[model samples]
Target chain A: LRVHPEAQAKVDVFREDLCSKTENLLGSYFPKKISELDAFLKEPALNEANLSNLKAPLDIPVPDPVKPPCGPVNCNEKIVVLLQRLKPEIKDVTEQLNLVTTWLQLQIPRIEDGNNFGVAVQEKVFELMTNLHTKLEGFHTQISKYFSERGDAVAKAAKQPHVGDYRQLVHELDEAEYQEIRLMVMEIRNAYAVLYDIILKNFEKLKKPRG
Target chain B: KPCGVRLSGEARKQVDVFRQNLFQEADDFLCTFLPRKIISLSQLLQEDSLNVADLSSLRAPLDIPIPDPPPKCGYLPGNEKLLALLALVKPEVWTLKEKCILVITWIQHLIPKIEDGNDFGVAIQEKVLERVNAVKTKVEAFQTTISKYFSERGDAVAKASKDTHVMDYRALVHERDEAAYGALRAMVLDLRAFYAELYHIISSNLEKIVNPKGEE
Candidate 1:
């Protein structure tokens, strides 16, 4: 069966038509273990639980250095839909920020003529600027940490060289090696966009014409 | 809409005059009307209907003619200004009903956010309720100030078109003030389009949030 094209074809059709729920099916298998993990994070109570492995799984599910699931079933179309749903939602919050920033924007020209969102813009501009700077600080730190650990796994793969060497000159990466590098690039791009949204909103506010 | 009656000599002339000037004022007034306010509002309502909905520009600002100035100032006369202004003030009359489909879809989204006692949704429903009340208060104050402007102009149109006083100052003064009536009426219509939609939105969303799980 492993050698036959017929066996592979049957799997492909079922994966396309009925595969809509593949994510939820896989998610169910992961055992969420959220409650168990929550129990283990409970400081002294977690320490007590750890001393008795007979009662529960030994280690709390702290995030591992590498994500077990990275391919399309976990992300792709589903994640895109989730993000699109969130786009309009940011309006109310953006409106609140805009209301204050707009008031300040209106105030600036009024200030040259001695009107007051006038001199008051300083505190808001400062607060907005500081918020952006602080947020970027964490964003960069997360990017560095994620990539450093990701770099380690890639280094491990490169050293081991998984190909059965018929010739050293062939020098080709196998399936898992290629997938791992693709995942690394995707992870970096994802972090880059998240940081971009935060930094852009404040700068856009600064650029708008004063009333 | 076709006027039910065929225009006779003088009335047809008057009707044509009223239609041309009135449409021009209505169109120009719409230029300032800032559909952007409604456009800007839809972005927020896009999440959940919330406080305001989109408003339709009058597809055709009515071509209806001036009749006797609203009856005796005491009883409303069959005047053209009053009819035009009223149409603007209550937009559902001339506005195409289908344009409001956006308004309906939004109300569905709005209800759950209002029910948010446990942070079941992102919005703090009660906090937004306070903001809604604030927006309403400012709108009412704005509406009253504008309504006063319209009624006073309506009175002038009444006094002028009525007095058979043959003098140029007495007769032409009302004609000169004709633009005033048209301008104010245009504004009343625009604001009515704005406020009426706001009222519909607030009422619809409040109903949804109040009985989200059931048919209200």
Candidate 2:
């Protein structure tokens, strides 16, 4: 847990880069394409009150990925160092997932408006999301299993002589993996942001009562 | 200072709360969509039943002591490229169906939810390519180091260490990396293709279902 202030900055930069850069890679999507599938299954018929809910599109802020908690100063420092170590791989998959989610959002309008292409994109997106979620989850478990064990193992090793370098090796791997996991979590949030937008956009047209 | 932002006490408190919620939400997200459970889809295709818990014990590209022959009926559907990837790690329970599905699911979840992922793509693309070139640069740097002690300066350590039997960095590490990198690259490319096919399948299905009668 090398969470130093400098490390926190690195984590923040990596997270920011993961979301913003990844989203920019592929063009933005609206969920209009998925409406067909939704109507076909899962989604219920929209009622009047629910459809015309008439609310502003809520804004969700982008979190600072490098959030160095200001608490016990040592704890803060540990957070920073840990985040700094993780900046690379953490940013990678996080970026990958972000690209994926944004793509899902863009296809919404087509599906919702009964566009054939839209429906296809929607289905593909759903399939892709399902598989991706699984892959990321697998990676997450691997990290957890490795980290929880290695964290304890490394801590124990620090007490021994001539084997202190092992502690660095173990901890670096943990931090790097931890960074990746954190990025994945962020990517999930990034996806939901668009999910909310798509849900709200499509539901606005409903001609039914609110549930 | 350059990014132009600071958190006040009120704002900081909200941020802290959001942080707590985000971590909790993230955990929930992973649980809702565990890769091992999803990968079991491949095992379903096989006659044998698979346990998701089994995956935690296995390595990523499974740790087979001795490679085995292909399954009687291959683990994946009839995709040649996919079959090749499965072949790389033979007699492994993790099937090609799992790999292909993972690639597709990853895209589905990633694209829709990601905002600003485009920028991340460019950075990653540039960076990954830059790394290979950097490797070449590092090799030259090592050459320079060797030259400084042995060739140019005629120093002792360089001459003594120059013997291939000394460290074996090339044979032990670099040579073996060739096979590993080849396998990994092949897997990624195949997965990329699978993702392409996944996109097409989804679009085609959506088109057919948008209207059963087939009129635009």
Candidate 3:
């Protein structure tokens, strides 16, 4: 379980860099929710829907943060809200990862003593990384599921010729919705990939630290 | 050089932790260069499956020697004269190879004083900051002198070539001043940065050594 001083130091630096990048990338992914909604609403779909519904113009303006949605909030808007809600959660996990990396760095010099100290440090790092990975996986699944289900709904509804302007509107909304989610997924997935690679590299080194 | 006062009780433990943290941080910095080191020489060429053509960009041309020039162009006419002036005024910039080793050596001498409880903060503030100021004072003076040289040299060049070639003389003077002033400022800024980093580390450690419990 004891690691060579050089390898241990390498792992420390790698893990620290990985955690920092993950945190920074996650923070960067905070969606421009209101602006996106405003832009999407301005698309022709809403006006087209209004003509079909026999109204002058559809009035589904972007929801105000102070008030509830016009209805139960459209499926796309719900996804936006979900991402915004998860921002704090993402921040918390990254902070936790930062602390673990810092702690691991502090333990790096002790590896020269050639004891179980290195093993003990890796154990805790893996625990935190594992939890973060699994948590991100869950978010990815939830997001992908919502978008695909919405995709299917739009596809089915678009089959009817009477479904006209509404289908196109819903279809466009679904595409935009999934595009944002895809970006979110890509950012988190990249973060996960970075941390996972470092963890795997360090874990392999852990098997034979002297190597 | 020794303070001859060994700390005991809580103070020694705090100093011990501070020392460990400082040393560990320095060690961590060395590891940060691991990426560059791994490919310090091209690694992709070592792979059996890869052709030499694939690693073309990674391969540095062995035939053409890299032009390793002095970091600054201090050889210009105006700055060359200023260099002589600076050597007389600020001899350490050249003799010590542009490093403030007096302060560095003084810090090294103060190493023995770190383990002492009472003198730790005093060594940091009095010795380190004083050394930093001494270094800064000379550089600031040097910068002022360089700035004045640029101004006066331009005018002198203009007047010297007043009858025959005013424009050409002024242009030459501008180019010389540009290189000279740039080199001089770069050296000054480099020194300032080095001292600044040293001051911060010492000052922070001094704070920790003086007040480990987060009170006064």
Candidate 4:
């Protein structure tokens, strides 16, 4: 069945605006938020005095400090659990991005007359796909490297659980996990949001090219 | 090569089938077979003696002869008398290099069959070809570097093996031999990374390359 030109034209305009908005979110807003979070998270917050006094003995019969509400207890375990949860989310996002990339690629028409505008759109789609692919790949590599490095630290800590330095290692890993993994999950969530918007907003354009 | 020409539906389908098979073969070789070989070679390098059987398992172009261990009074075997070890490594290295060349050639040849008058597919093909050529150039350089190492060090290694009584000379040669092996190992590792990158490029661009017209 043929689509009415007037209706299709109106759909195209709506699709264009929606695509531009999502494109801005994906290209600028999300990345900027991620970088700002990364910068904030990477800053050193540890006090040198506290680190140095990790081995210092406490007074006998000293009262325990009041527990802070909303503070993570057993942060190492929490970090491990968070990472395990993040893995599937990361994988799901990667799969969805791959699907979007392939769909956009398939929409690209062969060289033909009166399709230059369509080809240009496809090229833009390809460019965005490449950027997202690269960002995701880099994120994956960073996650894998963090896992390896953290695994080594945890193994070392396990071997010398009584040592103050090993405790410090665990403490540092806990801090790193809290900061880095939180930011990573944020990025992943943003990626998912961005993908959802792109798929929904440009449904018409993605479903049927205007060439 | 003519502009504005498009492949027929059946012809495009056939091209895609061939392209898919080629990509799968390339992936199997690069991702699976080559890595396994590299791991074997790495293990061989780490060990003191070269088992001819294990070397043969690599399926090197040349047959590996079992070399005898060094005598008690003789200079150290130092990894199967570096020269012999290198000789075994040479065939495997050449085999890898040749396979890379073969894969690159196949990819280079396939581009024309898949190309159409459209710029979109042409653009994708161009990028793929560029990456393929980069790999080709690097692999060629890899072969050259390896061949140079063999030619430059063959005599020294042979002399070190024979002049068993010269402890000082043998010691220096042994040190150099270890360094050479380290360098060779590094090169092979880099080659594996290159192949992986090439595979990524091809697999990422597979749809664009085989179906430029976007036909189902």
lDDT of 1 by residue, A30-52 (tens): 11222222222333421322211
Q: Write the per-residue lDDT of candidate 3 for residues B60-173, one digit (tens) a residue.
A: 111111234361111112334333333332332322222332333233223321121454454454555455556645654654454345345534443433323334554455
DockQ of each: 0.01, 0.02, 0.01, 0.01
Kept native contacts, fraction for each prediction: 0.00, 0.00, 0.00, 0.00
lDDT for each residue of candidate 3 in A1-211, tens digit (9 for 90 to 100): 7758988788768665655543443233212222233234344433233212321122333322233132222455534554664555455446645554564444343345555544653664556466565656666466555566555544433332122223333533343343334334333433433343344435423333233
Stretches of candidate 2 exceeding 4 Å from the true structure: A1-122, A139-143, A148-165, A198-211, B1-216
Candidate 3 deviant stretches above 4 angstroms: A1-79, A91-99, A102-114, A160-211, B1-216
Tell me how candidate 2 scores on lDDT.
0.34
Identify the leading candidate in terms of DockQ. 2
Cα lDDT tens digits, model 1, B95-172, are 211122222222222333112134332233334344444444444454444334433433333344344342443333
Off by over 4 Å in 1: A1-211, B1-82, B91-123, B138-216
In candidate 2, what are the lDDT values of residues A24-143, reduced to their tens digit? Answer: 332222122122222322213211123122121212222232341111111123333434433443444445555545534533442243434434435534554564566555654654
| Candidate 2 lDDT, B1-216, residue by residue in tens | 111122245433433343354445433433442344334333333422122233222222211123244601111111122223333322121223333223322322222222222345433323432432343343334323321221111111122223324443323322232333344333334433433443344344433322223344
Can you give the lDDT of residue B214 in candidate 2?
A: 31
Interface RMSD of the candidates, in order: 43.1, 25.7, 30.8, 22.6
Which 10 consecutive positions of candidate 1 chain A have the poorest summed lDDT? A163-172
For candidate 2, what is the DockQ-based docking class?
Answer: incorrect
Report the number of the highest-TM-score candidate: 4
| TM-score to true structure, per model | 0.19, 0.25, 0.22, 0.33
Clashing pairs in 1: B70-B77, B71-B76, B71-B77
Indicate the DockQ of the complex predicted as candidate 1.
0.01
Poorly placed runs, candidate 4 (over 4 Å): A1-211, B1-81, B84-88, B113-117, B154-175
